[PDB]
Design a protein around this nucleic acid. Structure first.
Lengths: 106, 148, 198, 177, 202
RNA sequence: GUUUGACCUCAAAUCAGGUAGGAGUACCCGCUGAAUAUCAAUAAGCGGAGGAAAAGAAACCAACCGGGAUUGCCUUAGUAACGCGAGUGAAGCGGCAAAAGCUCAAAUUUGAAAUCUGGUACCUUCGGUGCCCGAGUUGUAAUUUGGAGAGGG
RNA sequence: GUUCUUUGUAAAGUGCCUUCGAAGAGUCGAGUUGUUUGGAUGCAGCUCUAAGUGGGUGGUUCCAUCUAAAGCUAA
RNA sequence: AUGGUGAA
């Protein structure tokens, strides 16, 4: 059904391009559309309706929202009395505790 | 089992060479709308001599205009174009013109590198890096045309 | 009465005071998909271009004195974060806020009571607590939101208080103010500080 | 341009490639509603030469009509009735088989500001163009009406009923001739 | 795995090995003071260019984790193992020749030093590998108090100062995934990015 | 990757901006349509518009020393032609009324998708501007519609 | 008439020289079946389906005239 | 004949 097809035409490379209308000058010259856009932006800047990006960087750069309106520890010291410190036997039943230390640094 | 002119797709560039081609093409990404707009605004502010820009060619009509002029050196063709007739003849046209062509899976993937949601084809005419382009063309030829 | 889960889904509570409360967090979700699209496109310029609670504070605290109700927890969280997947910038901001608050307190010397404890050095102005300058050995997302809200509140609080640099590289009304006045203290390694000698 | 290649390829309708494309597309459409919105035309050259443009305001619809009031006229009438807010401009054949014939119709929405401000397409916004297919003003309708120049359309050059009325009237002037 | 990875690894290793070899040869020739076949007989350090004074200055060390393509050589492996800097002394004349070798793999004030010491807080303690936190100052007194260190603050002061705990303590002491975290990493890559005779880069 | 993204397709929202039915109907357009030739492309029925509608600038009329958008009137003419029977029945040329030509498909803007819809803040508000969003490359603008036309000097 | 603006190496036209120079396919057409015409034309289901110095309309070797298969436009 | 009305 789908028999192979012979490349009787593509087997020979096209020696020469088929097209015409030799190269326009615009291809060897900077685009006129770019110049038109640049001049339009220049006109806009002159009219003061466009801010240059350098000025935008500078522009890229706290209030009383209320004003006048009509609308504890548990003796866990580092050097507590020995009575506060829980006994070792009661520490098993405790499963923060006040503890005795020499000073603030220890 | 389909006519030979069909099923020329589903045979595509391998993963490694496809990735290399995508990496090469990403260098010549055309200036997106935001980049072009900001550059033009900067130029206007400066005004208020130029080198020719380099970018990939992706428009199907524009690419076909470049194709058959022998200017195109390497063309990428998407294999999932819904109107298949738009691309059935492109490989044959490239073969007749002697322009190397590579079928890459995914029109969305092809368009992702040209700032467009989808792109049927992509072609390169100018280069920055000519040795890399020549090596890629030779690899693509040896891996696709001589095999399939 | 509408259940908490049902009310949250629609948006135990009184329906009268909740139905009217249904009126940028939701809109911010679009930024994630825009960033994913930019990543898929393979160009970062669009991502950079895309990249480039006062209202709730007033209703919760219509007046400055009302802030004192939650200032306890606010200062607790701020001081806990000042010494603590929280970003380093958040920690730095929390530390700066606490340092500014302490500097303002010292300027007015509005302190009445203090108590050194195992949990930390307690203070009273309002009571607040700060932990020791040692490393601290839960879902931090709740903690992050609480920190953000408390920092936003404390920003306005500090602005109101203030309305009414090589050191960075080194760092009458009550008996507290009446006593120790002009008593310039010298503090050893454990006013002039010996640590600055380093 | 590539459109010339597309036209040349479409000229050989009975080619094995176009046969495969048609039999695939008809089967694909057989699983869809009789009338449904088309994302894009399957014959870009035909639509482009028929005046279709890829801009906001244009709509492409595919409609299936029973084989055996022409089939194109029936398709245009159906799409106009369904697309009451859109104006049918032209349509073209896209597929056929032993049971059904498929045509694609392009529609322009006059409400869209793009069409309203389009100097080359705002003409369709005039109320006189409402339901062009209803009055047979479309390409298929005009062809079925026999509107053309030459002896082959003398009896139907412009209006088959109008000529009958003209030749049946009795013109009487104030002063009899 | 594809051969490209191993090829790149080998090329980078060879290049960096040659770079280290030239640095070692230059240092060895400089040690002899025979400034007749070397580009620069003196030493430099880059912040701008700064002369490498002979004073044993002490500065913090940071890990750059790369170049990744460069498999770490044996000399660099040993240097990092001795300094335990593999995981991601002082600037003396005898330490510079070894620090320069690991220069591509690596890079203060009281405010930064104190915070770093009081936040990291590694303390080797007995399981045996415990290094959790600066739990209590009494731990330092027990393990290190014999050297005149009554608390971690003494260690901090002696590190800031030219003391002995600076040396003794050596025996005692964007990062996410997901789409949102990719842009920040890509931006930081610009800041993330070496001649043998060139000054050390800080 | 015992994952994360590009699209394409398909659904939904008391979403934002829009349009459609129907009425009237003398005239207009299309379909259908009776009481093998005749009443007849009539009567009746259905669908679609406006102040007019349709048509309109020839794959025309003519066989001349040629005319040159469409439409209406007189004339052509009760002629040619047909059903050669009762009967049906044109059209060019000629004179008059009024006259206007144009727009796409088609060959590269590729040295710059230069195009356009919508949101936002202003102003001189049947619209214009700065910014953003989206459509567009499976083609949006200019350049050409055979009277040729296009790149250059 | 009155008043402010233009501009931007911006857009067109005239004569000359030069290099190029696209054209609506299930469409035309034939066959058959229903339909209209006083026209034998046209309309309409369906098998097939055309070419580019090509195609359509008319007569004694052909000569005369246009370029259909898209659309807009007051009187 | 055309279009409708009610009626098993």
């Amino acid at each position: 059904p789908y028999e192979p097809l012979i490349d009787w035409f593509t087997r020979h490379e096209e020696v020469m391009p088929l097209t015409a209308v030799p190269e326009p000058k615009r291809r060897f010259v900077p685009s006129k559309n770019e110049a038109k856009r640049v001049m339009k932006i220049v006109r806009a800047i002159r009219e003061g309706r466009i801010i240059p990006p350098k000025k935008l960087k500078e522009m890229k750069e706290q209030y009383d929202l209320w004003g006048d309106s009509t609308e504890p520890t548990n003796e866990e010291s580092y050097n507590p009395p020995e009575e506060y410190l829980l006994s070792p036997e009661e520490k098993e039943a405790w499963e923060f505790i006040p503890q005795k230390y020499s000073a603030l640094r220890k | 089992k389909v006519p030979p002119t069909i099923a020329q797709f589903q045979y595509t560039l391998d993963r490694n060479t496809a990735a290399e081609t995508f990496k090469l093409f990403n260098k010549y990404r055309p200036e997106t709308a935001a980049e072009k707009k900001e550059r033009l605004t900067k130029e206007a502010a400066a005004v208020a001599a130029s080198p020719k820009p380099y970018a990939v060619k992706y428009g199907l009509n524009h690419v076909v205009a470049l194709i058959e002029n022998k200017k195109a050196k390497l063309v990428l063709i998407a294999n999932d174009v819904d109107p298949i007739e738009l691309v059935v003849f492109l490989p044959a046209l490239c073969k007749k013109m002697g322009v190397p062509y590579a079928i890459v899976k995914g029109k969305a993937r092809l368009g992702t590198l040209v700032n467009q949601k989808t792109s049927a084809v992509a072609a390169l005419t100018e280069v920055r890096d000519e040795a890399a382009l020549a090596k890629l063309v030779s690899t693509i030829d040896a891996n696709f045309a001589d095999k399939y | 009465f509408i259940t908490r889960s049902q009310a949250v889904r629609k948006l135990f509570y009184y329906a009268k005071d909740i139905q009217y409360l249904m009126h940028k967090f939701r809109e911010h979700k679009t930024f994630a998909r825009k960033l994913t699209r930019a990543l898929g496109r393979g160009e970062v310029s669009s991502a950079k271009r895309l990249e480039e609670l006062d209202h709730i504070i007033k209703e919760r605290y219509p007046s400055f004195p009302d802030a004192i109700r939650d200032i306890d927890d606010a200062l607790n969280m701020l001081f806990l974060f000042s010494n603590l997947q929280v970003s380093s910038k958040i920690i730095n901001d929390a530390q700066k806020i606490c340092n500014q608050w302490l500097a303002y307190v010292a300027k007015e010397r509005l302190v009445r009571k203090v108590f050194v404890s195992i949990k930390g050095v307690y203070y009273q102005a309002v009571r607040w607590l700060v932990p020791f300058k040692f490393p601290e050995n839960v879902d931090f997302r709740i903690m992050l939101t609480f920190l953000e809200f408390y920092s936003t509140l404390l920003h306005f609080v500090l602005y109101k208080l203030y309305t009414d640099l090589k050191k960075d590289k080194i760092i009458y009304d009550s008996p507290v103010a009446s006593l120790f006045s002009a008593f310039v203290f010298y503090v050893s390694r454990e006013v002039i500080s010996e640590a600055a000698m380093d | 341009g590539a459109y010339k290649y597309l036209e040349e390829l479409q000229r050989k309708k009975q080619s094995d490639v176009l046969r495969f494309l048609q039999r695939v597309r008809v089967w694909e459409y057989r699983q869809k509603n009789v009338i449904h919105r088309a994302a894009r035309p399957t014959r870009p050259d035909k639509a482009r030469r028929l005046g279709y443009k890829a801009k906001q305001g244009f709509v492409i619809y595919r409609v299936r009509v029973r084989r055996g009031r022409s089939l194109r006229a029936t398709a245009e009438e159906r799409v106009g009735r369904r697309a009451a807010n859109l104006r049918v401009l032209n349509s073209y054949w896209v597929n056929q088989d032993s049971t059904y014939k498929y045509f694609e119709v392009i529609l322009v929405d006059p409400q869209h500001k793009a069409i309203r401000r389009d100097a080359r397409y705002n003409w369709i916004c005039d109320p006189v163009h409402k339901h062009r297919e209803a009055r047979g003003l479309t390409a298929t309708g005009k062809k079925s009406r026999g509107i053309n120049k030459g002896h082959k359309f003398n009896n139907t050059k412009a209006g088959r009923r109008k000529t009958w009325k003209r030749q049946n009237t009795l013109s009487l002037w104030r002063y009899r001739k | 795995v594809r051969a490209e990875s191993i090829v790149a690894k080998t090329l980078a290793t060879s290049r960096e090995k040659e770079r280290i070899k030239r640095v070692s040869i230059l240092e060895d020739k400089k040690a002899k003071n025979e400034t007749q076949h070397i580009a620069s007989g003196k030493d430099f350090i880059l912040k701008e260019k700064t002369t490498y004074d002979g004073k044993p200055a002490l500065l913090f060390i940071v890990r750059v984790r790369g170049p990744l393509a460069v498999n770490i050589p044996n000399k660099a492996f040993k240097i990092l193992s001795l300094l335990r800097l593999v995981e991601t002394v002082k600037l003396t004349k005898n330490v510079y020749p070894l620090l320069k070798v690991i220069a591509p793999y690596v890079v203060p004030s009281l405010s930064s030093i104190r915070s770093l010491i009081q936040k990291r807080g590694r303390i080797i303690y007995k399981a045996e590998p415990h290094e959790i936190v600066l739990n209590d100052n009494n731990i330092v007194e027990e393990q290190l108090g014999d050297h005149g260190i009554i608390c971690v603050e003494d260690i901090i002061h002696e590190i800031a100062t030219m003391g002995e705990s600076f040396s003794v303590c050596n025996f005692f002491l964007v990062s996410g995934f997901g789409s949102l975290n990719r842009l920040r990493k890509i931006k930081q890559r610009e800041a993330e990015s070496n001649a043998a005779t060139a000054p050390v880069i800080e």
